[PDB]
Symmetry: D2
Subunit: 210 residues, 4 copies
């Protein structure tokens, strides 16, 4: 059996020198685990450009499953996102100075898109391996929600066979040295991400525990 | 232009014999402030029945503006909600024992509805009076989001002239006596609610700030 | 039966415009409640000078009870302090630029002083009136702990008949407008402070609970 | 020159079968790193008995440096403690049912004891290795503070040559699976602890920071 799984992580931004989402997905590049064969691409933390880079990664890799990963500084758990919202509302500018306020991602697109990943199943499997996980119901209104909405929009309109979604991850310890915030080690985050890609490759559907 | 503004607050939800959302909106019943003439109705913290009670309050009062209020224990600010989600996913049972998991509120309805209130404007006005306010992007998946989504569905399909939305409020101090959690006094919360009703009755368009 | 209660509050620091500890104790100046007769003085948020101002307030008013109040931004409850510590360790400079690091308050003084107030009784009485309260075991190492330690030192060495202590209070709502943080209204804080002064004037002895 | 460092950790408490402070120090037993030669002993989470077990470990091992470790569920950083307080005030009963309230540890002992470890130095060295650390000024009033005060009392009165202190550690991920709380991995915590032992074995002098 073989499902091709595209993982994306973002580049560094807003002060930081490392984006853990890219550090964790980069080491899974080329991994084969169960049915999953994993490839990893980096997306810029830039509005509009991130979506162009993702469309290119879909053309080049022809994936069956796409999991985009971003950092959510301050959370304590790996959180798969249930909902992408059609809004760009930037509190801070992106890496190229764009700061959209009140802007639609898709003019006339739906208000929201649900995730296509079996996220409750992913949460229970990550937890079986001893690492904290929970589903989140807001992915923010910055570049991470932008890429999630843009991904689901592309799937619905042009690649309906693809199962796609977004997972937010904590800070790693090295990033909370001058500011106390929760974190999870990079080893637990890359392990959780591998479990997510394999669970999404094996399972079509989700379980009803909530 | 006098605008009738319907305000609702939930009945005590198993945990106390008082619900602050009701206590606050009940004292604004009959208040007239600027163009706003305010009426208040209580809604049960029960899935499906809450919506039936709301439909009845809409028929009886014929409101121009509807602001539904509920309690969000743990928050620190008055938070107007930007997005209602088509999902009933109950961690705990409602007042009559219903605990829906993974259920659509409207089968075939949109995934989400945006608020119809000028919420950025409301946030800035509450803050001008010295009380903390912020827009929130998830209203949960319990009876409070249920009523919010049901409200906006009713408006979209049957009462397109009505401006409607949802505002979550914190605990009052009396509720954090055995469990430390943030709170706002009931006098600040009812004041914030009266400012929201007046701001919504005086302006159809929102500010762009965030 | 009449006890003179001296309350003090600090002026503002950091970048705030009101120090709620002064705003609250100022409105209790001249209040008589039960046995207590209350007078209020303001102390500067300056190391070493705060202590000189307090010594002067003790000479002038000849109090039976002294309760020094300061703001603890970020807490959620009124917190009477159990322990003062012999250390000035300033993360930020005070209002006149002093920033002591690793400095003894009293060279050769004890490492700590316990409060002289019936703080468990005070906590239970404030909570009986519906406002959250709890004892704290660190008052920090800035000017608020400095005044507390210096107060207890003054009492132990020169005024052993006086009952003295420190009470930290939260932000008021008006201070959490740009930064979300917990707060208590100024009406709840001044009412908690009047209850603390009256409870301390009526009982020399504390209850034993937590 | 070799310094024998004794580390302690506690036994299981509260429905758990493993205690991280003990899991982390147990794997350092017999380690030699720089000048430090480390031995580890387990202490019961029992008032009064913990102190007797510690006195026995001091007699048997004759250590130059003692670092007692306990878990502080909820914190986000490794926190060396600056102050031990002379008070047993138990919110919950210990492993054998003792629940002291308002009790002195040493009748007539000082109100507090300062740590004997170079804790600022320890904090900067742990952070150099990418793991979060900060000094704490309250170690609670349960069995962890009890052992810290009792240790410093023993040192002051009978073993003035020993350098001793206490370090609180976070939850590990496995413990925050049903309750979301911050954690650090057991590998990061045991690495922090070995760095603490070696920094204390090499430096009697502490540094001056903020």
């Amino acid at each position: 059996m073989e499902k091709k799984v595209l993982l994306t992580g973002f580049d560094p931004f807003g002060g930081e020198t490392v984006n853990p989402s890219w550090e964790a997905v980069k080491r899974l590049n080329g991994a084969a685990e169960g049915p999953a064969s994993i490839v990893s691409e980096q997306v810029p933390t830039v509005f509009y450009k991130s979506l162009a880079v993702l469309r290119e990664a879909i053309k080049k890799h022809q994936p069956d499953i796409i999991i985009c990963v971003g950092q959510a500084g301050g959370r304590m758990q790996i959180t798969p996102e249930r909902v992408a919202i059609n809004l760009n509302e930037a509190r801070i500018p992106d890496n190229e100075g764009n700061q959209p306020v009140g802007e639609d991602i898709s003019q006339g697109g739906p208000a929201a898109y649900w995730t296509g990943l079996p996220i409750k199943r992913i949460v229970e499997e990550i937890k079986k391996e001893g690492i904290p996980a929970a589903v989140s119901y807001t992915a923010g209104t910055f570049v991470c929600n932008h890429l999630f909405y843009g991904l689901m929009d592309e799937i619905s309109r042009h690649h309906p066979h693809i199962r796609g979604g977004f997972i937010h991850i904590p800070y790693i310890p090295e990033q909370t040295l001058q500011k106390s915030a929760p974190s999870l080690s990079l080893d637990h985050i890359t392990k959780a991400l591998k479990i997510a890609a394999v669970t999404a490759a094996v399972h079509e559907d989700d379980i009803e525990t909530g």
